[PDB]
Amino acid sequence: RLPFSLTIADISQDDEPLIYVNRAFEQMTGYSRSSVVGRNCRFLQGEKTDPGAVERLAKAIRNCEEVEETIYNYRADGEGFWNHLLMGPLEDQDEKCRYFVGIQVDMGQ
Numbered sequence: 439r440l441p442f443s444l445t446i447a448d449i450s451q452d453d454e455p456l457i458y459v460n461r462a463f464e465q466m467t468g469y470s471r472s473s474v475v476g477r478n479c480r481f482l483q484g485e486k487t488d489p490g491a492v493e494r495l496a497k498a499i500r501n502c503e504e505v506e507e508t509i510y511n512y513r514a515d516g517e518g519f520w521n522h523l524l525m526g527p528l529e530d531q532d533e534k535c536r537y538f539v540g541i542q543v544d545m546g547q
């Protein structure tokens with residue numbers, strides 16, 4: 439319930455599902471928490487989303503690395519917006535690197 443959109447994913451589970459989002463995520467994206475928990479966050483992506491940026495994100499996840507990218511996303515009502523995403527391992531010392539945390543900043547249209 440912080441003053442910024444935050445998400446946590448269990449990247450050890452198939453397709454790296456979201457396990458937690460906060461109210462700021464709901465307000466930015468237009469998706470209810472019920473609708474997104476258990477799904478990979480890429481439901482926010484679409485036709486204009488850059489594949490290079492998506493692959494930088496995937497690579498960071500595979501190598502348990504921090505990453506920052508500005509990516510084109512779509513709200514539930516279909517409005518496109520620029521999402522400045524910063525994410526990385528939740529737990530620096532976890533050799534198994536199970537969880538990833540990300541914040542999203544709406545940079546507009």
Ligand SMILES: Cc1cc2nc3c(=O)[nH]c(=O)nc-3n(C[C@H](O)[C@H](O)[C@H](O)CO)c2cc1C
Nearest residue numbers: 445446447478479480482495496538539540542
């Ligand atoms: C914790 C976490 C948060 C993410 N948040 C977003 C997001 O807000 N928008 C997006 O397009 N991709 C997001 N992704 C990336 C997406 O889920 C997927 O990993 C990449 O598109 C690479 O396939 C996030 C990934 C993780 C692990």
